[PDB]
Amino acid sequence: MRVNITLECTSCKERNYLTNKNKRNNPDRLEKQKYCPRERKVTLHRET
Amino acid sequence: AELKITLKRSVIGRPQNQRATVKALGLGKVNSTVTKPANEAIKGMVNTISHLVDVEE
Amino acid sequence: SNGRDSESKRLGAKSADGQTVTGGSILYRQRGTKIYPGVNVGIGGDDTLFAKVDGVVRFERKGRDKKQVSVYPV
Amino acid sequence: LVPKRVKHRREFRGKMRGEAKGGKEVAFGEWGLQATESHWITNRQIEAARIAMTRYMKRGGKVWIKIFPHKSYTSKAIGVRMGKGKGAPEGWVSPVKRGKIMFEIAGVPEEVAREALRLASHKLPVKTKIVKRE
RNA sequence: GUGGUGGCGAUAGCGAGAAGGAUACACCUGUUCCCAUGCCGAACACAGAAGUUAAGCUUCUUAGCGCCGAUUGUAGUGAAGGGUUUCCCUUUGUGAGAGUAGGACGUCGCCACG
RNA sequence: GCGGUCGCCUCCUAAAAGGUAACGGAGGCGCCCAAAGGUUCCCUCAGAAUGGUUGGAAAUCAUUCGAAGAGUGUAAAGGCAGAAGGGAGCUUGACUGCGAGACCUACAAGUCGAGCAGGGACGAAAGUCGGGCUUAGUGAUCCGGUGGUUCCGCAUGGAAGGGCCAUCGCUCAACGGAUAAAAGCUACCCUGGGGAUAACAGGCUUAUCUCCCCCAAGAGUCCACAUCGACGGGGAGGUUUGGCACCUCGAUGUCGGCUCGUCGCAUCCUGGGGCUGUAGUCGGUCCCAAGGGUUGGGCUGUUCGCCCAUUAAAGCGGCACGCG
RNA sequence: UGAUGGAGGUAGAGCACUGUUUGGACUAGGGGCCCAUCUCGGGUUACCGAAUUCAGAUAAACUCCGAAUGCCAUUCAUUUAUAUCCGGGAGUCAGACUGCGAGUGAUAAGAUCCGUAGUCGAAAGGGAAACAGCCCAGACCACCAGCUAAGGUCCCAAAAUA
Ligand SMILES: [K+]
Ligand SMILES: [K+]
Ligand SMILES: [K+]
Ligand SMILES: [K+]
Ligand SMILES: [K+]
Ligand SMILES: [K+]
Ligand SMILES: [K+]
Ligand SMILES: [K+]
Ligand SMILES: [K+]
Ligand SMILES: [K+]
Ligand SMILES: [K+]
Ligand SMILES: [K+]
Ligand SMILES: [K+]
Ligand SMILES: [K+]
Ligand SMILES: [K+]
Ligand SMILES: [K+]
Ligand SMILES: [K+]
Ligand SMILES: [K+]
Ligand SMILES: [K+]
Ligand SMILES: [Mg+2]
Ligand SMILES: [Mg+2]
Ligand SMILES: [Mg+2]
Ligand SMILES: [Mg+2]
Ligand SMILES: [Mg+2]
Ligand SMILES: [Mg+2]
Ligand SMILES: [Mg+2]
Ligand SMILES: [Mg+2]
Ligand SMILES: [Mg+2]
Ligand SMILES: [Mg+2]
Ligand SMILES: [Mg+2]
Ligand SMILES: [Mg+2]
Ligand SMILES: [Mg+2]
Ligand SMILES: [Mg+2]
Ligand SMILES: [Mg+2]
Ligand SMILES: [Mg+2]
Ligand SMILES: [Mg+2]
Ligand SMILES: [Mg+2]
Ligand SMILES: [Mg+2]
Ligand SMILES: [Mg+2]
Ligand SMILES: [Mg+2]
Ligand SMILES: [Mg+2]
Ligand SMILES: [Mg+2]
Ligand SMILES: [Mg+2]
Ligand SMILES: [Mg+2]
Ligand SMILES: [Mg+2]
Ligand SMILES: [Zn+2]
């Protein structure tokens, strides 16, 4: 089962990126290092 | 040197390129004549519409 | 049952050899690399060949059995 | 005669112009039957010609059938209006263009060869002539 | 002459055979070293110079394979026409593929050591 | 009408730029991958031969040959062995703000894009990275949800409610989406139009149909051709079943029968003749021949057909399947 | 229009790949069949025969090749005189036939659907007897003038009984 997800910056809680993931292959909430335009620096973004 | 080209055939029922070639040479009505330099371009135009014109020196 | 088809993609060459083109002009649309990008020519994400700089377009042969596009500024 | 398989069930009728691309000369046999016109030839016609030729030869000698009915042709049943897709495959033909050597024969005296080829030609739909191996 | 490094469509190739290591390149000796094998110092990496042209390597011979390929002729075809007009033919221009004469066992550069 | 189809991608049709239709010939899509993305480094396949326990055609192993005959998530085409195929390490560029200039294009959209800035991944560096070998994997607006917001806030401060940015809710699949919401009968029917479009007849075509032929395997005790004539081939006719939709829908009356006929000959009788598997009487087949003739009933609306009884014969067809 | 440079895979051709395919050589293997079985160890059909090889074909969805044309472009050359852009006003969205290149059809249709050129549509005139679409040819008018195109010249009926 593949579904679209939103990645939110853990620092400013800004819903920054849109992506998708296969729930079966990645049961746990995805986490990436992505640029946060509000803070203008790379930060940890976690799926909500 | 020179070429006297005279239109001996009508342009009705002819391809657009042949009609345009006649126009470019500057011929109008049938039996209309013109004089042009004997360049390669002019000779090529004459060859393109050779079946419609008669050419003299 | 038949009767389906996809819109034509208007592939092929978009600039003649010896023509002057501005930077970023598309030189060739293709699926895969039917022609390779030469000097000052980039290849897009979908194998489209475009000019990186202003200049005259030239289609050459890359070796024995491959073609190539280059853009030469004046 | 029918191909064991075909890449495509249905195929264009095509166009027959000019001489045959190849096979215009007798290759294996001593005598050959050359078509002087272009026309489709059905597997039924090939078989009829083959039977006539072989039976007159008394099943002696050897016979080669150079042509093969690669192409398929379809048709529409009576009472069917135009459209609604192409018709179902009906028969098999070989497009034969003038100059093609349809049949060859060997191992038989010349009179027998000529007579057998004459019978086969009358079965076929094209005008033909007899040719000897060079 | 050898070793690096390139340009040019293999006419640079492949196959077969012959010669050489003076130098150089190589095989070649080991794993202590940085480094490594989804196991193996075979490879990669490192240290060294006991032996060999055996191999690679370079030079040479060869047209067997591959490659390049003229002319002539023909198919096709633009234009102008004709016919008994699915097709076929005529004039003029263009002109292949195939087949063949033949070419070709490379040439044009830079650098270091001789 | 029924069946099929409706949007997107690939090929052929497509006539060597591009584009190009048919209820033309073939297939796919409504996804998938947290690596199957990025980068650095490294590697080269499929099959075959030979040898080798289980092990057999074919499991794994070794040498040689082997230029791609493999693989490339997924259809096909194009491309890729300087890899885009395969393995490993580290990573998240599957980045944010954009974007000269192009392609495509009625619009709406769609496609490519160097390059600049910010902050990064990998790499020593060069440099590469704005997803994946490329081309499908998608849906306008309105309306609503969620988050952010130095925007507005109907006297003023708030509030309510809006705006802007982000993103979600479409088999709106009839896929440029009529409405949030919708199936049928009409022979009781009616109106506006069309021969733009069917049913009758005409026209074109002749696959089919009828008729006539070619070749001659066989049948005919022998003997292809008295007679019949396979497998095949070629024509004529425009009476059949059909195809097309060209005249007629501000009307061309549609079966059969009756009245009246007329015409074609591919001749049913009568007339002439050839061949005969023609002893004679009968015949069979073919040729010439259209002058005349070519029926009365039972059944059925019938044509047709069967039957009854006759006749020299009880012809086949055209004439708007002649003639309201 | 010529010159030059290009991109592309059609006609044709070809078998280098992929399908289809004929014959020959050989044979794995398969079928029968015997002996001998432990189906097992052989000897056979000129039985069917893969793969290889020799020869020979074939293709819209095959290509080692590959035109003629058409197309793109050139501060190019000759001739010619239109092209863009901005705005006002439209009509058109039933096309027909002929030639050529294809599809559908039956390699039928005055059929249907495209590409291409012409004519009709919106074009009178001459020829094809009559005959929108064919051939020649584009009517601003007057002439009881002349030369020709397609097509024609014995009479209807102009011109050769050349
Ligand atoms: K015949
Ligand atoms: K070593
Ligand atoms: K050596
Ligand atoms: K060589
Ligand atoms: K990786
Ligand atoms: K709709
Ligand atoms: K009723
Ligand atoms: K009628
Ligand atoms: K007929
Ligand atoms: K006949
Ligand atoms: K007899
Ligand atoms: K009517
Ligand atoms: K009658
Ligand atoms: K008689
Ligand atoms: K009569
Ligand atoms: K009655
Ligand atoms: K009446
Ligand atoms: K082809
Ligand atoms: K046309
Ligand atoms: Mg397409
Ligand atoms: Mg991409
Ligand atoms: Mg050649
Ligand atoms: Mg074209
Ligand atoms: Mg094209
Ligand atoms: Mg990949
Ligand atoms: Mg207030
Ligand atoms: Mg729609
Ligand atoms: Mg009632
Ligand atoms: Mg009414
Ligand atoms: Mg009508
Ligand atoms: Mg009528
Ligand atoms: Mg019509
Ligand atoms: Mg009236
Ligand atoms: Mg008669
Ligand atoms: Mg009674
Ligand atoms: Mg009637
Ligand atoms: Mg009446
Ligand atoms: Mg061809
Ligand atoms: Mg029509
Ligand atoms: Mg009109
Ligand atoms: Mg007229
Ligand atoms: Mg009129
Ligand atoms: Mg005028
Ligand atoms: Mg005169
Ligand atoms: Mg007279
Ligand atoms: Zn943040």
Side-chain angles (χ1 to χ4, degrees):
Chain A
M1 176 50 53
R2 179 164 292 277
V3 187
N4 308 325
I5 58 163
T6 301
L7 296 178
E8 156 177 335
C9 181
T10 57
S11 301
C12 59
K13 307 299 181 298
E14 197 73 6
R15 303 248 179 86
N16 278 336
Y17 286 86
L18 175 73
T19 176
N20 58 109
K21 54 114 75 166
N22 184 287
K23 290 186 75 202
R24 176 178 293 98
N25 312 333
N26 310 282
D28 52 331
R29 308 208 298 177
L30 186 63
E31 295 187 353
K32 299 296 183 181
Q33 296 298 127
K34 306 291 287 183
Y35 183 83
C36 173
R38 181 177 181 170
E39 295 154 338
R40 300 170 58 201
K41 75 186 190 301
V42 171
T43 66
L44 179 71
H45 292 71
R46 181 178 298 100
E47 167 187 349
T48 39
Chain B
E2 284 287 15
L3 285 175
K4 186 173 70 63
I5 302 162
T6 189
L7 183 64
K8 302 296 288 296
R9 197 70 58 182
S10 175
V11 299
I12 301 171
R14 296 296 183 181
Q16 271 295 314
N17 64 34
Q18 302 182 6
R19 303 171 56 90
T21 300
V22 176
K23 179 62 173 171
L25 285 178
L27 306 169
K29 308 303 190 180
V30 181
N31 297 323
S32 299
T33 180
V34 71
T35 304
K36 296 297 190 179
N39 322 127
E40 282 300 341
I42 296 292
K43 279 145 69 173
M45 300 154 84
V46 159
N47 177 282
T48 291
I49 61 170
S50 58
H51 55 278
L52 306 178
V53 297
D54 285 46
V55 301
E56 305 295 345
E57 312 305 339
Chain C
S1 176
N2 304 316
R4 300 167 304 286
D5 196 353
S6 63
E7 299 296 349
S8 315
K9 299 296 183 181
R10 280 76 168 179
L11 306 184
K14 306 302 183 187
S15 305
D17 183 302
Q19 176 184 19
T20 297
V21 299
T22 57
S25 295
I26 294 171
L27 309 180
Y28 202 82
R29 298 277 208 175
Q30 54 179 342
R31 299 276 76 87
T33 174
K34 181 167 285 181
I35 302 181
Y36 286 80
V39 191
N40 315 323
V41 176
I43 183 169
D46 65 338
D47 314 273
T48 68
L49 316 183
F50 62 93
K52 286 183 174 174
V53 310
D54 308 2
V56 306
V57 176
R58 294 296 179 188
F59 289 87
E60 304 106 337
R61 27 167 293 273
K62 194 179 67 164
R64 165 184 293 270
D65 59 335
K66 296 183 175 180
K67 282 165 182 291
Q68 177 194 45
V69 192
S70 301
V71 177
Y72 298 112
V74 183
Chain D
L1 285 182
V2 181
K4 293 179 179 179
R5 290 167 40 189
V6 292
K7 189 190 290 169
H8 309 277
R9 274 237 298 168
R10 298 171 177 83
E11 187 170 351
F12 287 164
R13 290 134 170 104
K15 291 284 184 288
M16 290 176 296
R17 279 182 292 260
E19 307 298 325
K21 289 180 65 260
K24 290 177 286 188
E25 297 72 359
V26 183
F28 314 91
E30 300 170 0
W31 298 92
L33 188 57
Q34 188 182 48
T36 57
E37 301 175 341
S38 304
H39 202 286
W40 280 7
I41 305 196
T42 70
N43 57 6
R44 293 174 173 273
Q45 297 162 2
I46 292 173
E47 198 63 12
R50 197 273 301 172
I51 293 170
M53 232 158 46
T54 60
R55 98 201 316 166
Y56 179 83
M57 297 168 74
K58 293 179 179 179
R59 309 174 67 186
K62 193 117 176 297
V63 177
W64 297 262
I65 306 174
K66 306 291 289 301
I67 60 177
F68 185 90
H70 299 299
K71 184 174 288 185
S72 78
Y73 71 87
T74 75
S75 62
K76 286 187 171 297
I78 283 69
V80 177
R81 310 227 188 100
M82 297 291 91
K84 293 184 66 173
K86 196 166 169 66
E90 189 193 5
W92 301 90
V93 299
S94 177
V96 179
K97 298 195 290 187
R98 58 175 187 276
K100 189 78 175 185
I101 303 299
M102 295 169 293
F103 296 87
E104 298 178 4
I105 58 183
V108 296
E110 168 165 1
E111 287 195 3
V112 173
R114 292 182 178 276
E115 178 57 14
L117 297 179
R118 190 188 65 82
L119 300 170
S121 66
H122 277 101
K123 295 292 173 185
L124 289 175
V126 178
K127 304 178 80 77
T128 69
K129 62 181 290 179
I130 314 307
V131 183
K132 183 178 179 180
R133 180 85 165 284
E134 310 81 16

